[PDB]
Amino acid sequence: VIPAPVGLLAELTHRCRSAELDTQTWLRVLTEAAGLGVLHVHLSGGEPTARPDIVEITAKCAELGLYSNLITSGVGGALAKLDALYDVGLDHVQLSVQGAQPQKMQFAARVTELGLPLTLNSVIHRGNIHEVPGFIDLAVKLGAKRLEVAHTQYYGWAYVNRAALMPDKSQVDESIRIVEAARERLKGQLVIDLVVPDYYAKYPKACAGGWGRKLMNVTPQGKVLPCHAAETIPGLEFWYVTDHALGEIWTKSPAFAAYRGTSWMKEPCRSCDRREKDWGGCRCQALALTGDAANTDPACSLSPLHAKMRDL
Numbered sequence: 117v118i119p120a121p122v123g124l125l126a127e128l129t130h131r132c133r134s135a136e137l138d139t140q141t142w143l144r145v146l147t148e149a150a151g152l153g154v155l156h157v158h159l160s161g162g163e164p165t166a167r168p169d170i171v172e173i174t175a176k177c178a179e180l181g182l183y184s185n186l187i188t189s190g191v192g193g194a195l196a197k198l199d200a201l202y203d204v205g206l207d208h209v210q211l212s213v214q215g216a217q218p219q220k221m222q223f224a225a226r227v228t229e230l231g232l233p234l235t236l237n238s239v240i241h242r243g244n245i246h247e248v249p250g251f252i253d254l255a256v257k258l259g260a261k262r263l264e265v266a267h268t269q270y271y272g273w274a275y276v277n278r279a280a281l282m283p284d285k286s287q288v289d290e291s292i293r294i295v296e297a298a299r300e301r302l303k304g305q306l307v308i309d310l311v312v313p314d315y316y317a318k319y320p321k322a323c324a325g326g327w328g329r330k331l332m333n334v335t336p337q338g339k340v341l342p343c344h345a346a347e348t349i350p351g352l353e354f355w356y357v358t359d360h361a362l363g364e365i366w367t368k369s370p371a372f373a374a375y376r377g378t379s380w381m382k383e384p385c386r387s388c389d390r391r392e393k394d395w396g397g398c399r400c401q402a403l404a405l406t407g408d409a410a411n412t413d414p415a416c417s418l419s420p421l422h423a424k425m426r427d428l
């Protein structure tokens with residue numbers, strides 16, 4: 117009844133202090149993740165290249181057949197370690213291009229020069245959503261294979277830093293025409309991935325496929341979260357990889373079990389057809405916008421607080 121995980125977000129550090137895990141503990145987590153069935157491993161955190169053992173960690177992903185994605189800013193010593201990371205079998209690179217930046221270009225040019233698939237990532241909001249054409253030209257200029265533009269904080273999970281920062285319905289309708297025209301314009305050259313607030317949807321989307329249903333986030337100290345923003349929710353018992361095997365955390369840790377399945381649900385989700393399709397929406401949005409994480413996501417039209425959130 118409990119599904120196998122597919123992705124793993126490894127926050128290796130918060131650097132750009134001394135409480136970070138040892139190399140051997142990360143190598144164990146990667147091994148246990150492959151044993152559970154994880155496919156993708158996102159090497160990130162603050163700056164994953166700041167780790168001295170970043171090459172050995174990347175090599176273990178290749179040794180275990182895990183698809184490694186280096187989520188990095190591309191600044192500082194990131195370019196120095198790129199050649200070694202390529203040699204050990206780094207599968208993919210994701211450069212957050214939010215726009216000093218000259219050295220991001222040198223890192224990006226070297227990634228494509230080695231033949232690695234590059235993905236520019238950028239966070240868009242009401243202020244900088246007019247910059248989407250500039251991001252499209254940059255991705256083509258650098259020769260990236262993919263371009264991500266998302267109003268959410270972390271791609272995959274549906275959570276925002278603030279509500280007033282979100283873009284207009286007019287801006288979303290505008291950013292569809294820009295992205296769709298550029299998709300046809302660059303069918304084979306670039307892949308464009310847009311994530312924006314759905315102002316026409318009556319029902320919400322499953323956040324990361326559902327709580328405790330796909331992804332794991334592992335903090336630098338070894339704390340395992342069902343999502344990046346899960347520490348927002350109070351009363352959750354997170355387990356550490358230093359005290360349990362990853363499989364026991366995925367299946368038995370109270371933080372993962374808390375909002376997994378449908379037994380936790382309040383109305384209207386508890387008596388709803390779509391309860392096992394979107395899983396009540398996003399827990400963190402519910403908490404951040406209603407005060408209780410077990411509430412229905414206000415993004416849903418059946419939420420009683422949808423009338424207030426829509427006016428905001």
Ligand code: SF4
Nearest residue numbers: 385388390391396416
């Ligand atoms: S009510 Fe709960 S389950 Fe039914 S749609 Fe709205 S969110 Fe998804």
Ligand code: FES
Nearest residue numbers: 323343398399400
């Ligand atoms: S971000 Fe949607 S569940 Fe935590």
